[PDB]
Amino acid sequence: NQEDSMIMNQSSIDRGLFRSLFFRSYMDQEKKYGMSITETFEKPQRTNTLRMKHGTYDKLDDDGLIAPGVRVSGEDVIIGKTTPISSKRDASTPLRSTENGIVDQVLVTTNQDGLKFVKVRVRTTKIPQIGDKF
Amino acid sequence: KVFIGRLPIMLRSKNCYLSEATESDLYKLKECP
Amino acid sequence: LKYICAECSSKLSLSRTDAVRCKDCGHRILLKARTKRLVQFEAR
Amino acid sequence: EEGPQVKIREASKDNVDFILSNVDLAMANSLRRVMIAEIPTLAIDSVEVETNTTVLADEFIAHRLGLIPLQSMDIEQLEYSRDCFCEDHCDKCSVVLTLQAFGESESTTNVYSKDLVIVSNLMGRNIGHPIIQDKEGNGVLICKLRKGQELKLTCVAKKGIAKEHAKWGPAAAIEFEYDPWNKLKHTDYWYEQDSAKEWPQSKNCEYEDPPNEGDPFDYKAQADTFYMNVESVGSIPVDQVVVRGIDTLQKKVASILLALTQMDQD
Amino acid sequence: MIVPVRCFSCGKVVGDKWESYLNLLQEDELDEGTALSRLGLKRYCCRRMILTHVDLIEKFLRYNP
Ligand SMILES: [Zn+2]
Ligand SMILES: [Zn+2]
Ligand SMILES: [Zn+2]
């Protein structure tokens, strides 16, 4: 506990001392093009382009979103979307490489322009570890 | 008579619904009292 | 059963180009109800 | 009887105030530790959620179901998942609980450790029962809910000890003192004016002869007689949290002998 | 934010005692300092636990679906 660092009762940390939650919210829209050219939310595959991500798309349901119970991690995909250009160039959103957790709540809405607006949210519990500040 | 742009509004101020709202009104409104 | 309404919590759902409103409350929000695949948790 | 003796001062169902006499400090302490940490207990350790709409989040609850004390009288006759031969778990190694709650009432419905329902067979033995010491008999308020908030889990409690986690601790606080009249000089009181006047005299001061100036310092004076007090959480009966302590520590010292012999072979 | 089950410091159960304590307050018209002693919460490690918990959940519950 020398030089401004302290020792912390482990047992206490277990009994629940200082635990915390942590939410993060990724977001996204289906671009619009003056001359009716829209993107979409879906669980894609090859079908020409291949410019897709590297992580699992599976956890993806069919509307291109995850279900609020799923445990996600690595670069798992949280949202499936595609850009039409001439066919299937990816545009999905992977969980920030670092993090990992559980999907908390998903929400699908319209944005003034009548576009499909959507936001995901991952919850994570963070127990006090050694390098932690206090 | 005429429409001239849009003025963003400060929350909890006169022109905001929340202003006259009360305990129960808010929780239903989902805003935190 | 699939999507839901923020206020008038009423199981709804639909598919592509079926608008994005609820059956009653216009309130264009809508969530996405849990997964049927049960999830396990460490108890500590 | 023979070696280190006892003389239980007050005692109840949740506290065994007593006096360990003619022992070694080392041993007195070893025992202390053992009690707090290595005594086998049972507690939830896997929580499968089916549905939840509470305001608390999944793991939040889970955490809790862990500390909800559980029966464990016959724990010593249940195996550690890790040692049983089943692919994962069985009645031979674990107890399963269930908990369900719907906000039927129009006014905050409460979920108590009493709504836990065992499912697996206990093959007849005191184990897995949500210890309740509550006055009204509900014990540990797990979580509250409103309108149509549901909550369906499924738990699996296993053996396990403190080192692994604290939820398996059966001890919880353990009073310990000795030589109340600093006779061995194992301390050196800090003071402004007078030691004695500023620094409280312990209850234990009685059961031991006061100093008496004149006399020189008894250096040869080792240290026997310790005023402990083992409280309990319930899982196990206060007495046991001492007997099994004495036992566990016993078996550990045993193993060293044991391994010291398979090592004799070559 | 519901009662902490057990005390961080010493592990002594404390989940149950929420309701009880809250009565020896409003009903039995007692003072915190004793309501606790009444409930067997001797030393402050356990004490500080109840006397300080801020049961937000109640305010949470009051929302909706
Ligand atoms: Zn609606
Ligand atoms: Zn087994
Ligand atoms: Zn305590």
From Swiss-Prot, chain B:
Assembly and binders: Component of the RNA polymerase II (Pol II) complex consisting of 12 subunits.
Organism the protein comes from: Saccharomyces cerevisiae (strain ATCC 204508 / S288c) (Baker's yeast)
Record's subcellular location: Nucleus
Extra remark beyond the main annotation: The binding of ribonucleoside triphosphate to the RNA polymerase II transcribing complex probably involves a two-step mechanism. The initial binding seems to occur at the entry (E) site and involves a magnesium ion coordinated by three conserved aspartate residues of the two largest RNA Pol II subunits. Present with 18700 molecules/cell in log phase SD medium.
Superkingdom, taxonomy of origin: Eukaryota
Protein name: DNA-directed RNA polymerase II subunit RPB2
Annotated signal peptide: none
Coiled-coil region: none
UniProt family annotation: Belongs to the RNA polymerase beta chain family.
Function: DNA-dependent RNA polymerase catalyzes the transcription of DNA into RNA using the four ribonucleoside triphosphates as substrates. Second largest component of RNA polymerases II which synthesizes mRNA precursors and many functional non-coding RNAs. Proposed to contribute to the polymerase catalytic activity and forms the polymerase active center together with the largest subunit. Pol II is the central component of the basal RNA polymerase II transcription machinery.
From Swiss-Prot, chain C:
Single GO BP term: termination of RNA polymerase I transcription
Subcellular location: Nucleus, Nucleolus; Peroxisome
Keywords: DNA-directed RNA polymerase, Metal-binding, Nucleus, Peroxisome, Ribosome biogenesis, Transcription, Zinc, Zinc-finger
Gene Ontology CC entries for this record: cytoplasm; nucleolus; nucleoplasm; nucleus; peroxisome; RNA polymerase I complex; RNA polymerase II, core complex; RNA polymerase III complex
Chain sites annotated for binding Zn(2+): C5, C8, C22, C25
Entry keyword Metal-binding: yes
TM stretches of this protein: none
Zinc finger region(s), C4-type: 5-25
Post-translational modification, as annotated: The N-terminus is blocked.
Keyword Metal-binding included in the entry's annotation: yes
Entry GO MF terms: DNA binding; DNA-directed RNA polymerase activity; zinc ion binding
Function: DNA-dependent RNA polymerases catalyze the transcription of DNA into RNA using the four ribonucleoside triphosphates as substrates. Common component of RNA polymerases I, II and III which synthesize ribosomal RNA precursors, mRNA precursors and many functional non-coding RNAs, and a small RNAs, such as 5S rRNA and tRNAs, respectively. RNA polymerases are composed of mobile elements that move relative to each other. In Pol II, the core element with the central large cleft comprises RPB3, RBP10, RPB11, RPB12 and regions of RPB1 and RPB2 forming the active center.
Family that this chain belongs to: Belongs to the archaeal Rpo12/eukaryotic RPC10 RNA polymerase subunit family.
Other comments on record: Present with 907 molecules/cell in log phase SD medium.
Protein name: DNA-directed RNA polymerases I, II, and III subunit RPABC4
Gene: RPC10
From Swiss-Prot, chain D:
Any one GO MF annotation of this record: DNA binding
Cellular component, GO, one term: nucleus
Subcellular location: Nucleus
Gene Ontology biological process terms from the UniProt entry: RNA-templated transcription; termination of RNA polymerase II transcription; transcription by RNA polymerase II; transcription elongation by RNA polymerase II; transcription initiation at RNA polymerase II promoter
UniProt: Zn(2+) binding residues: C84, C86, C90, C93
Domain of life according to the entry: Eukaryota
Keywords recorded for this protein, A-Z: Acetylation, DNA-directed RNA polymerase, Metal-binding, Nucleus, Transcription, Zinc
Family (UniProt): Belongs to the archaeal Rpo3/eukaryotic RPB3 RNA polymerase subunit family.
Note: Present with 10000 molecules/cell in log phase SD medium.
Subunit structure: Component of the RNA polymerase II (Pol II) complex consisting of 12 subunits.
Function: DNA-dependent RNA polymerase catalyzes the transcription of DNA into RNA using the four ribonucleoside triphosphates as substrates. Component of RNA polymerase II which synthesizes mRNA precursors and many functional non-coding RNAs. Pol II is the central component of the basal RNA polymerase II transcription machinery. It is composed of mobile elements that move relative to each other. RPB3 is part of the core element with the central large cleft and the clamp element that moves to open and close the cleft. Seems to be involved in transcription termination.
Protein name in the entry: DNA-directed RNA polymerase II subunit RPB3
UniProt source species: Saccharomyces cerevisiae (strain ATCC 204508 / S288c) (Baker's yeast)
The encoding gene: RPB3
Curated annotation (Swiss-Prot), chain E:
Family matches, as Pfam families: RNA_pol_N
Cysteines engaged in disulfide bonds, as pairs: none
Keywords: DNA-directed RNA polymerase, Isopeptide bond, Metal-binding, Nucleus, Ribosome biogenesis, Transcription, Ubl conjugation, Zinc
GO cellular component, one term: RNA polymerase II, core complex
One record GO biological process: termination of RNA polymerase III transcription
Compartment(s) of residence: Nucleus, Nucleolus
Binding site for Zn(2+): C7, C10, C45, C46
Example of a GO MF term: DNA-directed RNA polymerase activity
Main location: nucleus
Cross-link (Glycyl lysine isopeptide (Lys-Gly) (interchain with G-Cter in ubiquitin)): K59
InterPro entries: RNA_pol_su_RPB10, RNA_pol_suN_Zn-BS, RPABC5/Rpb10
Extra information: Present with 5300 molecules/cell in log phase SD medium.
Entry function: DNA-dependent RNA polymerases catalyze the transcription of DNA into RNA using the four ribonucleoside triphosphates as substrates. Common component of RNA polymerases I, II and III which synthesize ribosomal RNA precursors, mRNA precursors and many functional non-coding RNAs, and a small RNAs, such as 5S rRNA and tRNAs, respectively. Pol II is the central component of the basal RNA polymerase II transcription machinery. Pols are composed of mobile elements that move relative to each other. In Pol II, RBP10 is part of the core element with the central large cleft.
Family in the record: Belongs to the archaeal Rpo10/eukaryotic RPB10 RNA polymerase subunit family.
Protein known as: DNA-directed RNA polymerases I, II, and III subunit RPABC5
Species this chain originates from: Saccharomyces cerevisiae (strain ATCC 204508 / S288c)
